[PDB]
Design a protein around this ligand. Structure first.
Ligand code: FAD
Ligand code: MTE
Ligand code: TEI
Ligand code: MOS
Ligand code: MOS
Ligand code: FES
Ligand code: FES
Lengths: 1290, 98, 49, 49
């Protein structure tokens, strides 16, 4: 016992004191110093902790390789298992592996925080299949999330493992040689001989007992009934980490062969309760391929479920038994097992029974009919009898890896060769606090016939038997209930098809009897080639990959927490408010102090400077007297380890006295709770405008917020020096300047005493433009008070609850227009939920108003905005910065004008489009207005017109599935709306060896700023990029810098760098002249010798900026970035799910500095857009407490979420004279283009409604953002969504 | 190293900028702030670095002038902030060659 | 006989041959290029404080 | 040296010549390797530059 022995990257590890509560992720990072594996959620949803596990399987007598999430893997399950991390397959210090090389060169890595886990997911695949199919290559990443790339590049690059200029050359890719893959640990292979012995581990609070035989398992359970079993820990791991649970004694049966046995008997196939889903999946698939269709009906059912069950990492460790016994109300398997009466063999020392699963198995919430000394031994999924058909459906928010809203298992058995029901079972998940069977409804059908009437009765039955009270947990009452009837309808239609033999059904119906299908992907990228005669050394204009791609693809790239820890470094865990608004009447730390390693509890009282922080001094560093939102920081605990601070922080007792809370925009308006006074831009004559307008439309629209979900959450390391109040901080932020002065204000020391350094961020998107100071300042206080360096990285849920997100908008519009579709008047009043703090909320509203016009000329217009002061975490900036909201509202009422007029949308839009020279509503000339060219080119290459026909034909031939097609344009104002922020500095040193070191005020987060800056300096200085290097961003090299935001960082820092290079070239001239034939090195040295300085600054101030809302005059932007997108979708009017078929984008980036970075920026922003408009949605309780706090409940776009055909194009011949090297900001502009998916869906919803609902060609139904499957399904009204007062009114 | 170079340099900048020494600070020496430096030797470090600091202070005073003029009665803090707002760089190098 | 004898702390970063050194010296420039010559990496990769 | 030490910070002790001038005919580290905590012995051979 006691000794835990495993291997990591070939090297043998012998841990003599394994603690049962230790995960592999923590071990690899803390104990083994291998920071390649990252932490992104800890719930198993992102895959940033993916590692490969190899072991010798007995039963197959072979070495197996599988992926697994290190964050959920207890190390005590790894005895004699060989772990493989990212750093274990290659590196820049030796040689990258084909996987790491391709993803890097393919531009499949931006901030690169997700890159390691994705490299391992693709690695495991290749390690199992050296020649995968395009389909297996995709299914490999269902447990992996990327927030930067838009996924397209990751998939195109790896597509080369399968089976005009271009962004990469696959011919230069090194071929994969398996004969060179690290061999299985020889020692580890000799141990396979020795008979497994029972091990035992003792951690701080838990005891782990690894059983080796069934007999021992049964004995253990007898002696310790309360002891929990753990196999995959993908359930227990969540309960301990998130549910604050303590299972003091654990038993792992994983080794026991009988719990891993697979048997093919006459009744069906049997699996041991420890078999991993991936195994069950493998077995079943082979069973389906070999046995007749009629015997595999239930098998195919399980397969459809396992199909959208987590990802590869979870299915490789999750046990069949584990799923059943956990008894989750939303289990995807139990429903199927119950509808088929799957045989369950339960045992205990002495006893042994076998009972079929049925409704009685799940007595109450999360409980089953097992004895406290019983353990599930095996499961026998049944073969399928004649005249017996099965089906299994599941529907969530996102198709790939997600918790089901409603899931089911459906089975029917008829009398021999008849259509008469003998047995009928309908079992659902997501309708109760346990899996249930609609027995009442199914009884009334026994002996009845499979017909239109049965369909009618059942739906009525289900609708009554599975009703949900308004206060239903999880809400979505209507959608959930509709899904049970719709699911049955599909079952009903499918059975008819199946009762049709073959060796029938309506022509427009079979489509509703078909399982999900992935069509083959097709992506094209086209940008412009560089001038035929340009130096091969002038990289500007070429698709140069991100200078750090390789190191990110190898785990060598360093992120804040990756930075080693000091021997005396302490950890900080924030203690936050659990009430939306209340008084703090008392804080008790008696419990905390008792936790091992507890150092101290920090609160407002400890701050030496002022507790007044935030961009407008309306926030606190630490809450004092009252809390004003759930998650509001009250204090923090410091301890010797993360675990200890976390536990200690969890028992700090805060006693509140609630106060009247204002949660929604409504109450904000109701109670008149705002920040500042109304904003406004008015032009023309409204009264006069509507008065001349043929038609007038009024409405109200809503757009949900959004969580940044950068893979690397907020993080800060504070190092107190000891002298003069000096402190050095390593922070994941886009605003070093504010971090610097805020930290100084809190401490009360001059700003010159504080140093902030930013290597790189694993994602920012604005979530880190200012809200990062919430963590920085807290860590700084702990450093200050303790004297030791302190650090803190927020957990996903803390990040989601505290950091704030995108602003939710509420608009009340009214637009007048002519029959032709010409807008004559407009009036939109915007309201944004600002949070318990001003922060950036105000400038965001302005950017919104500057974009309520999108690309259209509106003679008479008026827009206003208010900031709703609510008791929610203060919202902040988010890629788009208010622009996306305004553009959305603009395109909503525009879409309505088209419907109302009865005219094609492109036509309505095009005629309303601005024209070269026009003035915006804020009076600014649109010079170099290229939307027209983008519009024409997009329409043409997308084949819009030819495809619109295609779309309608489909809609005609299809009854339960429709297709939408929409084409949207956009224009983004480039520049900070605050004039004084449009400045940038740069410091450049040339060392005596000729090597250059550049430093600018800009920070890197995956956008490729440092790459672009190197390219600029290399062109500027006329030397290879190899001689240039950018190490980081720091407050002592370039002071008073504006945050890396507004998409101008390239525009302004590149100009600052450029200037510096010039000073350098000027100083070096005298020497280049004296020695024309000399090298760069010669001149530099000559200049050093002649005592000429090789160090200068660079600076830039953007000219002619300064708009006034007072006089609606003055430039607000330096210029505009334009772009057009055309998307096509297909919805399933019966479930709410949909698939993006194809999108076509044409962006005007001007003369691109790097077409690989720009395009990756276009595809990336675009996907975060479709995410905002159709997938991402946050939920809060009425009292202001967020529900969605992890990837499991907050679904951002997955690999399988991008348009099947993703085509991007950068407009040719259109240099932008306003910015460095004729380029244009490409950061935010494209994000709104994801709206084309939204309006494409709406287009499909119309087709649906015209099918079973109204008959009004010009009906205007409200569809808010995000257009989730709930909103989509509910808008597809039919006999389902559709199907007793004493007296009436009449 | 104990000779008092940083003290002397603060004194020079304080006279140069005409502000109390309290508002000035020297934290350390690093190859990324001032490259290709000669060793701190030959007893000239005060002579030469002080001249380099001095020069820097001048560039600063020159950049801040327009603001001192626009607001004679203002404080050092007022002018600096005014210069930041007007997007005027508050960072410069200094150099000296004997 | 300076009271503090010679002393150096080297911190390898892990990327691009980057290294940060905390040294008791009066010649950061030579420390910088000598360290670089020994490692064989551009001088811009080495930081001396 | 007053600067705090990293949790994984290692220590180096120079191995010097005891002869005023001579040939190095052999270097043996068998004894060193036996000392608790020994990580490695560096010599001219290890220098990358
Ligand atoms: C990212 C992520 C995505 C997921 N997606 C889905 C999904 O799409 N559909 C779905 O249904 N679930 C999903 N889950 C839930 C998950 O798959 C299950 O709870 C897992 O199957 C359980 O197996 P396990 O081996 O990990 O279990 P464990 O964590 O060990 O937990 C099992 C529980 O069952 C008990 N138990 C286990 N084995 C036995 C046995 N042989 N005899 C008696 N009692 C036993 C344990 O005591 C414990 O209470 C997901 C989890 C993560 C982390
Ligand atoms: N991969 C990645 N791309 C990104 C971000 C990010 O955090 N990661 N930030 C976005 C936001 S919100 C902005 S404002 C711009 C900023 O680009 P820039 O730094 O070149 O100006 O990049 C965009 N692209
Ligand atoms: C992205 C974006 N950020 C903006 C902004 C506006 C005011 C600010 O600080 C105000 C304080 C100093 C009074 C900061 C910061 N830091 C940033 S404007 C803008 C845009 O896009 O227009
Ligand atoms: O949204 Mo980006 O400006 S921070
Ligand atoms: O002797 Mo001093 O120049 S180093
Ligand atoms: S951190 Fe393990 S899946 Fe995200
Ligand atoms: S590059 Fe994938 S999450 Fe940033």
């Amino acid at each position: 016992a006691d000794e835990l022995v495993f291997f990591v990257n070939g090297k043998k590890v012998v841990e003599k004191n394994a603690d049962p509560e230790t995960t592999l992720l923590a071990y690899l990072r803390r104990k083994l110093g291998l920071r390649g594996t990252k932490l992104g959620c800890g719930e198993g949803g992102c895959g940033a902790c993916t590692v490969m596990l190899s072991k010798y399987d007995r039963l197959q007598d072979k070495i197996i390789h599988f992926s697994a999430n290190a964050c959920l893997a207890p190390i005590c399950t790894l005895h004699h298992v060989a772990v493989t991390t990212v750093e274990g397959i290659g590196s820049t210090k030796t040689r990258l592996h084909p996987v790491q090389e391709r993803i890097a060169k393919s531009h499949g890595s931006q901030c690169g925080f997700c890159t390691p886990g994705i490299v391992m997911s693709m690695y495991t695949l290749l390690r199992n299949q050296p020649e995968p199919t395009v389909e297996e290559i995709e299914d490999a990443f269902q447990g992996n999330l990327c927030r930067c790339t838009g996924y397209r590049p990751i998939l195109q690059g790896f597509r080369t493992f399968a089976k005009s200029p271009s962004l990469f050359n696959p011919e230069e890719f090194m071929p994969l040689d398996p004969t060179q893959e690290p061999i299985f640990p020889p020692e580890l292979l000799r141990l396979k001989d020795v008979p497994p012995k029972q091990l035992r581990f003792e951690g701080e609070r838990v005891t782990w007992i690894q059983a080796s035989t069934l007999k021992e398992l049964l004995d253990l359970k007898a002696q310790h009934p309360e002891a929990k079993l753990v196999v995959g820990n993908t359930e227990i791991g969540i309960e301990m980490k998130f549910k604050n649970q303590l299972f003091p004694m654990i038993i792992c049966p994983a080794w026991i062969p009988e719990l891993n046995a697979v048997e093919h008997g006459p009744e069906g196939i049997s699996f041991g309760a420890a078999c991993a889903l991936s195994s069950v999946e493998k077995t079943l698939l082979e069973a389906v391929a070999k046995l007749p269709t009629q015997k595999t009906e239930v098998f195919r059912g399980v397969l459809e479920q396992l199909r959208w069950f987590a990802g590869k990492q979870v299915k490789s460790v999750a046990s069949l038994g584990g799923n059943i016994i956990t008894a989750s109300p939303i289990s995807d398997l139990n429903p199927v097992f119950m509808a088929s009466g799957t045989k369950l063999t339960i045992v205990s020392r002495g006893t042994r029974r076998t009972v079929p699963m049925d409704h009685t198995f799940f007595p109450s919430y999360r409980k089953t009919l097992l004895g406290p000394e019983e353990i599930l031994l095996s499961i026998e999924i049944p073969y399928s009898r004649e005249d017996e058909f099965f089906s299994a459906f599941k529907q969530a928010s996102r198709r790939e890896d997600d918790i089901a809203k409603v899931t089911c298992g459906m089975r029917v058995l008829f009398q021999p060769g008849s259509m008469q029901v003998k047995e009928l079972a309908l079992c659902y998940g997501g309708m109760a606090d346990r899996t249930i069977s609609a027995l009442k409804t199914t009884q009334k059908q026994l002996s009845k016939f499979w017909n239109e009437k049965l369909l009618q009765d059942v739906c009525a039955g289900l609708a009554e038997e599975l009703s949900l009270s308004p206060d239903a947990p999880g809400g979505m009452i209507e959608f959930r209930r509709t899904l049970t009837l719709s699911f049955f309808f599909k079952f009903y239609l499918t059975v008819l098809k199946k009762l049709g033999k073959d060796s029938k059904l309506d022509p427009t119906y079979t489509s509703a009897t078909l399982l999900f299908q992935k069509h083959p992907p097709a992506n094209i990228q086209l940008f412009q080639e560089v001038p035929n005669g340009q130096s091969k050394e002038d990289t500007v204009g070429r698709p140069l990959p991100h200078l750090a791609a390789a190191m990110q693809a190898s785990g060598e790239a360093v992120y804040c927490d990756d930075i080693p820890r000091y021997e005396n470094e302490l950890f900080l865990r924030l203690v936050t408010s659990t009430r939306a608004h209340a008084k703090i009447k008392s804080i008790d730390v008696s419990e905390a102090q008792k936790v091992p390693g507890f150092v101290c509890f920090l609160s407002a009282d400890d701050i030496p400077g002022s507790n007044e922080t935030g961009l407008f001094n309306d926030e606190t560093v630490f809450a004092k007297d009252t809390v004003t939102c759930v998650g509001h920081i009250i204090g923090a605990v410091v301890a010797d380890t993360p675990e200890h601070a976390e536990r200690a922080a969890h028992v700090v007792k805060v006693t509140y006295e609630d106060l009247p809370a204002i949660i929604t925009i409504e109450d904000a308006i109701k109670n008149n709770s705002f920040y500042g006074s109304e904003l406004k831009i008015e032009k023309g004559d409204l009264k006069k405008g509507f008065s001349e307008a043929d038609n007038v439309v009024s409405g109200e629209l809503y757009i949900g917020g959004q969580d940044h979900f950068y893979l690397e959450t907020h993080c800060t390391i504070a190092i107190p020096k000891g002298e003069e109040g000096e402190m050095e901080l390593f922070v994941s932020t886009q605003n070093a300047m504010k971090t610097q002065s805020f930290v100084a204000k809190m401490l009360g020391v001059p700003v010159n005493r504080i140093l902030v350094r930013v290597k790189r961020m694993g994602g920012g998107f604005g979530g880190k433009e200012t809200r990062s100071t919430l963590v920085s300042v807290a860590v700084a206080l702990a450093a200050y008070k303790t004297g030791h360096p302190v650090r803190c990285m927020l957990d996903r849920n803390e990040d989601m609850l505290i950091t704030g997100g995108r602003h939710p908008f509420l608009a009340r519009y009214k637009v007048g227009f002519m029959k032709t579709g010409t807008i004559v008047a407009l009036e939109v009043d915007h309201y944004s939920n600002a949070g318990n703090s001003r922060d950036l909320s105000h400038s965001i509203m302005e950017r919104a108003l500057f974009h309520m016009d999108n690309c259209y000329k509106i003679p008479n217009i008026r827009g206003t905005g208010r900031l709703c002061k609510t008791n929610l975490s203060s919202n902040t900036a988010f890629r788009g910065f208010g622009g996306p909201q305004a553009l959305f509202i603009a395109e909503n009422w525009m879409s309505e004008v088209a419907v109302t007029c009865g005219l094609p949308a492109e036509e309505v839009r095009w005629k309303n489009m601005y024209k070269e020279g026009d003035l915006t509503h804020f009076n600014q000339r649109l010079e170099g207005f290229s939307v027209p060219r983008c519009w024409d080119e997009c329409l043409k290459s997308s084949q819009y017109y030819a495809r619109k026909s295609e779309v309608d034909k489909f809609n005609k031939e299809n009854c339960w599935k429709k297709r939408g097609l929409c084409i949207i344009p956009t224009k983004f104002g480039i520049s900070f709306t605050v004039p004084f922020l449009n400045q940038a500095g740069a410091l450049i040193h040339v060392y005596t060896d000729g090597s250059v070191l550049v430093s600018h005020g800009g920070t890197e987060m995956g956008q490729g700023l440092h790459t672009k800056m190197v390219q600029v300096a290399s062109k500027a200085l006329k030397i290879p990029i190899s001689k240039i290097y950018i190490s980081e961003t720091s407050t002592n090299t370039v002071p008073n810098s504006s945050p890396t935001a507004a998409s101008v960082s390239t525009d302004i820092y590149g100009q600052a760098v450029y200037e510096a290079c010039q000073t350098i070239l000027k100083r070096l001239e005298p020497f280049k002249k004296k020695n024309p034939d000399g090298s760069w090195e010669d001149w530099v040295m000559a200049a050093y010798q002649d005592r000429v300085s090789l160090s200068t600054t660079g600076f830039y101030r953007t000219p002619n900026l300064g708009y006034s809302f007072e006089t609606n005059s003055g430039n607000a932007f330096h210029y505009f970035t334009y772009g057009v997108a055309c998307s096509e979708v297909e919805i399933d009017c019966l479930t709410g799910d949909h698939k993006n078929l194809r999108t076509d984008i044409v962006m005007d980036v001007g003369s691109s500095l790097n077409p690989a970075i720009d395009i990756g920026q276009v595809e990336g922003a675009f996907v975060q857009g479709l995410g905002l408009f159709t997938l991402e949605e946050l939920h809060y309780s009425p009292e202001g407490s967020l529900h969605t706090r992890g990837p499991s409940t907050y679904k951002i776009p997955a690999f399988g979420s991008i348009p099947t055909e993703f085509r991007v194009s950068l407009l040719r011949d259109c240099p932008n004279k306003k910015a460095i090297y004729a380029s244009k900001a490409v950061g935010e502009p494209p994000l709104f283009l994801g709206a084309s998916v939204f309006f494409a869906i709406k287009d499909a919803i119309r087709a649906a409604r015209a099918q079973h609902t109204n008959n009004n060609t010009k009906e205007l139904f409200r569809l808010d953002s995000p257009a989730t499957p709930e909103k989509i399904r509910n808008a597809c009204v039919d006999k389902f969504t559709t199907l007793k007062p004493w007296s009436l009114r009449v």
